[PDB]
Scaffold this motif. Structure first.
Motif, PDB file in Angstrom:
ATOM      1  N   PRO B 120       0.801  -1.230   0.000  1.00 15.27           N
ATOM      2  CA  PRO B 120       0.000   0.000   0.000  1.00 15.27           C
ATOM      3  C   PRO B 120       0.831   1.275   0.000  1.00 15.27           C
ATOM      4  N   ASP B 121       0.130   2.404  -0.053  1.00 10.30           N
ATOM      5  CA  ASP B 121       0.757   3.717  -0.268  1.00 10.30           C
ATOM      6  C   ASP B 121       1.043   4.465   1.050  1.00 10.30           C
ATOM      7  N   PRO B 122       2.329   4.643   1.397  1.00 11.96           N
ATOM      8  CA  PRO B 122       2.685   5.403   2.604  1.00 11.96           C
ATOM      9  C   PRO B 122       2.356   6.890   2.446  1.00 11.96           C
ATOM     10  N   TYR B 123       2.165   7.342   1.204  1.00 13.68           N
ATOM     11  CA  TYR B 123       1.882   8.746   0.893  1.00 13.68           C
ATOM     12  C   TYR B 123       0.593   9.269   1.517  1.00 13.68           C
ATOM     13  N   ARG B 124       0.697  10.289   2.364  1.00 10.61           N
ATOM     14  CA  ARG B 124       1.955  10.731   2.954  1.00 10.61           C
ATOM     15  C   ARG B 124       1.753  10.590   4.447  1.00 10.61           C
ATOM     16  N   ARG B 125       1.216   9.428   4.799  1.00  9.00           N
ATOM     17  CA  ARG B 125       0.623   9.158   6.098  1.00  9.00           C
ATOM     18  C   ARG B 125       1.625   9.206   7.249  1.00  9.00           C
ATOM     19  N   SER B 126       1.152   8.891   8.453  1.00  6.36           N
ATOM     20  CA  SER B 126       1.977   8.987   9.654  1.00  6.36           C
ATOM     21  C   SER B 126       3.240   8.142   9.548  1.00  6.36           C
ATOM     22  N   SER B 127       4.197   8.426  10.422  1.00  4.06           N
ATOM     23  CA  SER B 127       5.435   7.664  10.473  1.00  4.06           C
ATOM     24  C   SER B 127       5.182   6.235  10.943  1.00  4.06           C
ATOM     25  N   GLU B 128       4.198   6.056  11.825  1.00  2.00           N
ATOM     26  CA  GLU B 128       3.753   4.718  12.210  1.00  2.00           C
ATOM     27  C   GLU B 128       3.338   3.917  10.984  1.00  2.00           C
ATOM     28  N   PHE B 129       2.669   4.582  10.049  1.00  2.00           N
ATOM     29  CA  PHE B 129       2.305   3.937   8.798  1.00  2.00           C
ATOM     30  C   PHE B 129       3.556   3.552   8.018  1.00  2.00           C
ATOM     31  N   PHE B 130       4.493   4.491   7.926  1.00  2.82           N
ATOM     32  CA  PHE B 130       5.781   4.256   7.278  1.00  2.82           C
ATOM     33  C   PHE B 130       6.546   3.132   7.976  1.00  2.82           C
ATOM     34  N   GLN B 131       6.358   3.031   9.289  1.00  7.95           N
ATOM     35  CA  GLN B 131       6.949   1.960  10.085  1.00  7.95           C
ATOM     36  C   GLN B 131       6.425   0.597   9.625  1.00  7.95           C
ATOM     37  N   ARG B 132       5.102   0.476   9.531  1.00  8.87           N
ATOM     38  CA  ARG B 132       4.457  -0.733   9.019  1.00  8.87           C
ATOM     39  C   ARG B 132       4.975  -1.109   7.639  1.00  8.87           C
ATOM     40  N   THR B 133       4.828  -0.168   6.710  1.00 12.28           N
ATOM     41  CA  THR B 133       5.265  -0.313   5.325  1.00 12.28           C
ATOM     42  C   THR B 133       6.702  -0.813   5.229  1.00 12.28           C
ATOM     43  N   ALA B 134       7.555  -0.312   6.115  1.00  8.04           N
ATOM     44  CA  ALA B 134       8.950  -0.710   6.133  1.00  8.04           C
ATOM     45  C   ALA B 134       9.092  -2.197   6.441  1.00  8.04           C
ATOM     46  N   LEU B 135       8.389  -2.678   7.466  1.00 10.11           N
ATOM     47  CA  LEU B 135       8.392  -4.101   7.805  1.00 10.11           C
ATOM     48  C   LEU B 135       7.759  -4.943   6.704  1.00 10.11           C
ATOM     49  N   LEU B 136       6.707  -4.423   6.079  1.00  4.53           N
ATOM     50  CA  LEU B 136       6.072  -5.130   4.969  1.00  4.53           C
ATOM     51  C   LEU B 136       7.038  -5.198   3.799  1.00  4.53           C
ATOM     52  N   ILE B 137       7.732  -4.092   3.562  1.00  3.03           N
ATOM     53  CA  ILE B 137       8.780  -4.054   2.557  1.00  3.03           C
ATOM     54  C   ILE B 137       9.987  -4.864   3.032  1.00  3.03           C
ATOM     55  N   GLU B 138      10.312  -4.766   4.319  1.00  2.00           N
ATOM     56  CA  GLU B 138      11.412  -5.548   4.881  1.00  2.00           C
ATOM     57  C   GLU B 138      11.113  -7.036   4.783  1.00  2.00           C
ATOM     58  N   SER B 139       9.888  -7.418   5.136  1.00  2.00           N
ATOM     59  CA  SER B 139       9.467  -8.814   5.055  1.00  2.00           C
ATOM     60  C   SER B 139       9.586  -9.309   3.619  1.00  2.00           C
ATOM     61  N   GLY B 140       9.117  -8.493   2.679  1.00  2.00           N
ATOM     62  CA  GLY B 140       9.178  -8.830   1.268  1.00  2.00           C
ATOM     63  C   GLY B 140      10.582  -9.137   0.777  1.00  2.00           C
ATOM     64  N   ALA B 141      11.543  -8.323   1.199  1.00  2.00           N
ATOM     65  CA  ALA B 141      12.925  -8.434   0.739  1.00  2.00           C
ATOM     66  C   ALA B 141      13.644  -9.705   1.210  1.00  2.00           C
ATOM     67  N   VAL B 142      13.202 -10.274   2.330  1.00  2.00           N
ATOM     68  CA  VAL B 142      13.800 -11.501   2.869  1.00  2.00           C
ATOM     69  C   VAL B 142      13.542 -12.718   1.984  1.00  2.00           C
ATOM     70  N   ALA B 143      12.345 -12.783   1.415  1.00  2.00           N
ATOM     71  CA  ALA B 143      11.938 -13.939   0.635  1.00  2.00           C
ATOM     72  C   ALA B 143      12.593 -13.922  -0.740  1.00  2.00           C
ATOM     73  N   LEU B 144      12.768 -12.724  -1.285  1.00  2.00           N
ATOM     74  CA  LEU B 144      13.423 -12.551  -2.572  1.00  2.00           C
ATOM     75  C   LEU B 144      14.862 -13.044  -2.557  1.00  2.00           C
ATOM     76  N   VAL B 145      15.594 -12.683  -1.507  1.00  2.00           N
ATOM     77  CA  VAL B 145      17.010 -13.015  -1.416  1.00  2.00           C
ATOM     78  C   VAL B 145      17.231 -14.488  -1.094  1.00  2.00           C
ATOM     79  N   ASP B 146      16.286 -15.116  -0.403  1.00  2.00           N
ATOM     80  CA  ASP B 146      16.422 -16.546  -0.134  1.00  2.00           C
ATOM     81  C   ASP B 146      16.283 -17.404  -1.405  1.00  2.00           C
TER      82      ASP B 146
END
Lengths: 153, 152
Positions: B120-146
């Motif tokens: 989803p779109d962090p634009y231009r919501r709270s930093s807590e939202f950006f926090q979530r998005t980061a983990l969702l993006i962080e979670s995503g990046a783990v599976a790609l590299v494996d």
């Protein structure tokens, strides 16, 4: 192999441009030299100024840019050389540098051998201003990278 | 070697964060890989938004960032893989990729074991939202590299 810092007032314009131009040239000759940037004055900003970064893509740099940094007392010990853009940068750096390290400090253009000794202040100036600025910093850069290329025998 | 492209709408938020985190993880895995970000929409901006850069610092990522590009036909042949954050990103991507390369597209959450697979779109919501998005993006990046460790 060698650690280098570059300093301006805010770390917005001249030091990152210097840092990006420096990294490209160090890279093209496979030199074990790393370079950073840092300001003297602390800013709210997170990234270097936009106008400042446009001026360097126009000359063919695809820059991975480091976030804004203010200069820290560990830098006077970490880095083998520290370069100042204008002398107002160089005084403020000296009001703060341990006497054991004032020998690291030199202006940027110091090795150019040119009418230019300082790099003037581009902040909030015309894009055309940044063109010239990028060149002044560019010239200062190659002198250093060629200089450093020499002390190694 | 390898090339990977991650795309979103503005290249302001998600594709930038995905770009840093992949670099970190490819680093940790000392792999023959590099990654780019890019937008689909044109924009007259130069750096990813700050709220997006901090969200990676909070998580201890050094956000040393390529500036914002928009996607170009060159991206379809430079890179091995291209990833959409949205599915809206995936429509826009498919509207322009040559027929011989549509086998490069995937969602970013492709290899995550999670139900819904859009970022989803962090634009231009709270930093807590950006926090979530980061983990969702962080979670995503783990599976790609494996997978990449064996996608060969």
């Amino acid at each position: 192999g060698l650690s280098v810092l570059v300093v301006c007032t805010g770390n917005l314009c001249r030091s990152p441009m210097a840092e990006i131009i420096l990294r490209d040239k160090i890279r093209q000759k496979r030199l074990n030299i790393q370079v950073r940037s840092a300001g003297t004055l602390k800013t709210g900003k997170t990234m270097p100024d936009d106008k400042a970064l446009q001026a360097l893509q126009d000359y063919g740099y695809h820059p991975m840019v480091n976030p804004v940094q203010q200069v820290t007392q560990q830098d006077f010990i970490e880095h083998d050389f520290i370069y100042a853009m204008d002398r107002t940068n160089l005084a403020d750096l000296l009001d703060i540098c341990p006497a054991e390290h004032k020998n690291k400090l030199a202006l940027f253009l110091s090795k150019a051998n040119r009418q230019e000794k300082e790099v003037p202040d581009p902040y909030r100036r015309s894009s055309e201003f940044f063109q010239r600025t990028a060149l002044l910093i560019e010239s200062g850069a190659v002198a250093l990278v060629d200089s450093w290329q020499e002390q190694g025998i």
